[PDB]
Write a protein that binds this DNA or RNA. Sequence first.
RNA 1: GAGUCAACCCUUUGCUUAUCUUCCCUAUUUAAAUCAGCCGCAUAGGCUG
Lengths: 248, 301, 55, 55
Amino acid sequence: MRKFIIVKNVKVDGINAKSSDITVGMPPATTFCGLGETMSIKTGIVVKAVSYGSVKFEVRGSRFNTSVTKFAWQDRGNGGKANNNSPIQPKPLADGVFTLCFEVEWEDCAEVLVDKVTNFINTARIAGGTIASFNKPFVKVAKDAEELASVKNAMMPCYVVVDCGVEVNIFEDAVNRKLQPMVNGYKKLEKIVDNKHMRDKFTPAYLATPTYTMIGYKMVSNVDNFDQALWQYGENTKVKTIGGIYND
Amino acid sequence: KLKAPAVLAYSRKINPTNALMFAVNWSDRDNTTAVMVGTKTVAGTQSVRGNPNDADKGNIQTVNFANLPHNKNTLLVKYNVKFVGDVFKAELGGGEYSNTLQTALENTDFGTLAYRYVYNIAAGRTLWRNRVGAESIETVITVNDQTFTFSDLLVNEFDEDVDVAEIADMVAGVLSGEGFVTLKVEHYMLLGEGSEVFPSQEFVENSKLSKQLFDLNGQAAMHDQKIGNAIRTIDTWYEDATTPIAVEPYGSVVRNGVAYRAGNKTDLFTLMDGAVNGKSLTEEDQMFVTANLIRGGVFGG
Amino acid sequence: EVFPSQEFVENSKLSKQLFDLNGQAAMHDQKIGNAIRTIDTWYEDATTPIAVEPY
Amino acid sequence: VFKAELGGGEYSNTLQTALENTDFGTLAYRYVYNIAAGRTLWRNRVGAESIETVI
RNA sequence: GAGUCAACCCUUUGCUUAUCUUCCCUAUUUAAAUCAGCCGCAUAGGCUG
């Protein structure tokens, strides 16, 4: 809360939009969680709150059958047939411009952190994307809850993502309320016994499936209280909001 | 013992961006404009081999086009590319097998690879059909806050150049373990007045159109994959067939349907196993086996 | 009056559209191409020739 | 001329070797005459008093 | 990880007959817009091609 770093107008190219076998479009927040923990392990700072926004997002193609990428032969099972019409493997892409706002606590200096975070961002990936151009990150200061509104007056304009809740199950509710799904986390089902082809020989191997939650894209000014937009790690590998159920 | 791993991965060392296309005057380079796309209709007969009967039927079709405005004469193709080091550091799979290849490599000359890559960037091979009919092609490149102006031509008859050597040496040093370097490519061309322009296509399931053009918020643009394929065409390491091709395992381009580097003892995986079991080989092939290693991807199966 | 090219669009309000670049009458750059390459005076009959194309 | 954009290493080369024995002057003359005669200008020329071409 | 080349959309056309829009009204208060020029890190006569 003491120090916030903001980067705006980040141009990302060639985003892999196929997040799952059914979800195509905006990347899930689990990639944001992974990048945040990677930044925590690399720089050495514990991060609690994560925030992001959407500015531009264009999917390559048209109303349906957006984009297909031609994949060539990259396996050692060729030589005779490897001369015409390599397998297709449909996988659409996209393009976007986003922004990030992160919290950091550090009292040794004030600008070395900017140096190292910029250095790391310069050599990163965004869901298979690539950073093209970004503005210089800037620093903001906050103290406690009542003055928090100041930050909403500091980095306009953008969209915000807010939780609204589900009633019984989403299979019909998503269509009925015409909001969009999103993968809040993964639920483990069984343990992978084999430990042969893994990238490590000590990390436990589990199998999991995505779980779907309800989020909505609204205007910042239309948000009555900001704590609905905070994400905190919860029990059973879940992510929750500080404010709970939305109410007027 | 020393079983070939079926899973191995390497990072995309070369990262190109989305090439962006503009119309600007030859002598008024301060003011530029974007190029739109638009949509038009065509009506041509059927030219299909072995079908005399269907020559008396019409055909109405709809396609996208792109060209300079009524009064402009310069095409401006600009983008950014990034070179990163960290070579011989696996990102997915392999902790004690990459080093066994490393102790065989590091005897190759990265300077040649950098020279060829920068020569490809400077000459203009990144533009496929835009160079047909242009008398003047030049570029300006700004890296590390220093600028260089190139008027390079003659993609044929490769010759040593000492004016481009410094940037080649810089990036070659970058590859052998460093951070990142970013280059801004700003190709200028004077194709003509009102002539057609060729931006990258993409194919979709049969729709209202039949030739769609890549658009980035009402402006023509080129795919990243095509630029990346332009960067990695250096393979001059076989005894014939000049005008080299792009580098990849089982190297053969489907566009014209040629089959080079077949199962005739010139491949990628056929080399290191016979090198470690037997004598080493010529300096030519280490060049190739590191070239296709620099491009990222997943290898195995 | 003049005669620029015409478009064949799906069922819209208009019934006879016209080609235009930023609102300016013009002709497609293949009608001119078809007019340039009409020199095929090289078959058994029919002077006042036709264009050059297979079949 | 005489190089295919896609494919062709032996068929196109042999076809070329058979060709370039004809005369390009006739084709160039007919093309430039079609440009100069105004035939590239389609049926706006109906009811024309006098026309000129500046090339 | 490259969607790549080629193309004539043409001919013809009567939009026209009539029409009431109408009553009522407090914009209030405060105001400051101020010839780079030689030796001088100086708002003391100025001998300057």
